[PDB]
Design an enzyme around this catalytic site. Structure first.
Site, PDB file in Angstrom:
ATOM      1  CD  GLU A  76      -1.175  -1.304   3.367  1.00  0.00           C
ATOM      2  OE1 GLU A  76      -1.210  -2.511   3.018  1.00  0.00           O
ATOM      3  OE2 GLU A  76      -1.803  -0.859   4.360  1.00  0.00           O
ATOM      4  CB  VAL A  92      -2.576  -1.851  -3.920  1.00  0.00           C
ATOM      5  CG1 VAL A  92      -2.782  -2.644  -5.200  1.00  0.00           C
ATOM      6  CG2 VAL A  92      -2.264  -0.400  -4.240  1.00  0.00           C
ATOM      7  CG  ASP A 129       7.664  10.008 -11.577  1.00  0.00           C
ATOM      8  OD1 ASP A 129       8.888  10.119 -11.374  1.00  0.00           O
ATOM      9  OD2 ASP A 129       6.895   9.613 -10.690  1.00  0.00           O
TER      10      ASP A 129
END
Ligand SMILES: Nc1ncnc2c1ncn2[C@@H]1O[C@H](COP(=O)(O)OP(=O)(O)OP(=O)(O)O)[C@@H](O)[C@H]1O
Ligand SMILES: [Mg+2]
EC number: 2.7.11.24
Length: 357
Positions: free
Chosen positions: A30, A36, A146
């Site tokens: 997470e 998640v 990114d």
């Protein structure tokens, strides 16, 4: 029905109700932003990944969130992760979090590189897919900003998908210049040299440099420019790339930037073959064109695709382009997290069963 939770232990690992559609659940790491977990998509009977997002308290998470939702919803490509579902409360008053449902991907380049050693064919295929997905993004006039191994997801068949468009922006060359040593938010190690000098990162060549960094890491399993801080990053680059030419220094009208560069002792270029002794000579040529100090001389995505190293995969009619360039007004360090919330709510409406019940 709240009667659905998944071992919080910290963050927002408590409640995790996703209605009738997502059964079998299991946490997958997470962060202090969202949790998640895989889950069983009964309707499709397949296993997916669900990210719990709780952004309305922080307007920067709210802007990164709205931003990523609009782009990911507009894009349609085999190499860019897609949102399959979005779960939220029926009303703005009851909406505290959001659940983005995406395809389940076994691992990502970051974890793989920590353990496996890629074969040249694996390297070529992974690079191929990155550039293929990247050619589509840049065709819509968007910059990821990114890209790094952890933003590249892989499944067991070696299918690669780019994710994380929280820092993506529409290209803006006319507003890219800035002073020397300007704060930046993207990941240090994959930051282009011009970022620490006079760029805001509103140019596509910013992404190419990052992919260049990724190729090198794939070739050695080690980050090639790991600066421990802002300027250290820049001195890592100059150490391998060596001192920039006059013609290149002549492109830096920025006096503070230029004078710092001249204050530095001379450094010769370290040839890539001394760095990667067992690398394919073609891969190194491409690596060379991507990790070009001068942004104006740095290779373009399309050019990278047509490079000899990738001739086994190169196929222009199988490398799609966006149908219409992207655009979204608000791109500012500010917008009331009051306006954004009701904007996020509206962006996510198409996923509500209002069109089913
Ligand atoms: N579709 C997905 N497949 C498998 N797990 C996921 C899925 N959603 C991201 N991955 C993995 O789950 C993790 C956490 O979610 P997220 O992508 O938001 O953060 P991260 O990649 O860990 O790091 P960061 O904070 O930089 O995003 C990472 O290990 C990531 O690679
Ligand atoms: Mg990420």
């Amino acid at each position: 029905a709240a009667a659905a939770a998944a071992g919080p232990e910290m963050v927002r690992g408590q409640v995790f109700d996703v209605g009738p559609r997502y059964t079998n659940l299991s946490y997958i790491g997470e962060g202090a932003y969202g949790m998640v977990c895989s889950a069983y998509d009964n309707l499709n009977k397949v296993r997916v990944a669900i990210r719990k997002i709780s952004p309305f308290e922080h307007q920067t998470y709210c802007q990164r969130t709205l931003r990523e939702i609009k782009i990911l919803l507009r894009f349609r490509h085999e190499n860019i992760i897609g949102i399959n579902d979005i779960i939220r409360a029926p009303t703005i008053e009851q909406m505290k979090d959001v659940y983005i449902v995406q395809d389940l991907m076994e691992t990502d380049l970051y974890k793989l590189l920590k353990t496996q050693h890629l074969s040249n064919d694996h390297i070529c295929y992974f690079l191929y897919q990155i550039l293929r997905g990247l050619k589509y993004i840049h065709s819509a006039n968007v910059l990821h900003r990114d890209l790094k191994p952890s933003n590249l997801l892989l499944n067991t068949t070696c299918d690669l998908k780019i994710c994380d468009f929280g820092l993506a922006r529409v290209a803006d060359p006319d507003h890219d210049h800035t002073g020397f040593l300007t704060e930046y938010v993207a990941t240090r190690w994959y930051r282009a040299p011009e970022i620490m000098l006079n760029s805001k990162g509103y140019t596509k060549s910013i992404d190419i440099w990052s992919v260049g960094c990724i190729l090198a890491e794939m070739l050695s399993n080690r980050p090639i420019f790991p600066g421990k801080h802002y300027l250290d990053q820049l001195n890592h680059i100059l150490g391998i790339l060596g001192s920039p030419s006059q013609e290149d220094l002549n492109c830096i009208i920025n006096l503070k930037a230029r004078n710092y560069l001249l204050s530095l002792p001379h450094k010769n270029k370290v040839p890539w073959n001394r760095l990667f002794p067992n690398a394919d000579s073609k891969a190194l040529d491409l690596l060379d064109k991507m990790l070009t100090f001068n942004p104006h001389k740095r290779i373009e995505v399309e050019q990278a695709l047509a490079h000899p190293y990738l001739e086994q995969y190169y196929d222009p009619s199988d490398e799609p382009i966006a149908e219409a360039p992207f655009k979204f007004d608000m791109e500012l360090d500010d917008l009331p997290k009051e306006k954004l919330k009701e904007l996020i709510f509206e962006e996510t409406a198409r996923f509500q069963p209002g069109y089913r019940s």
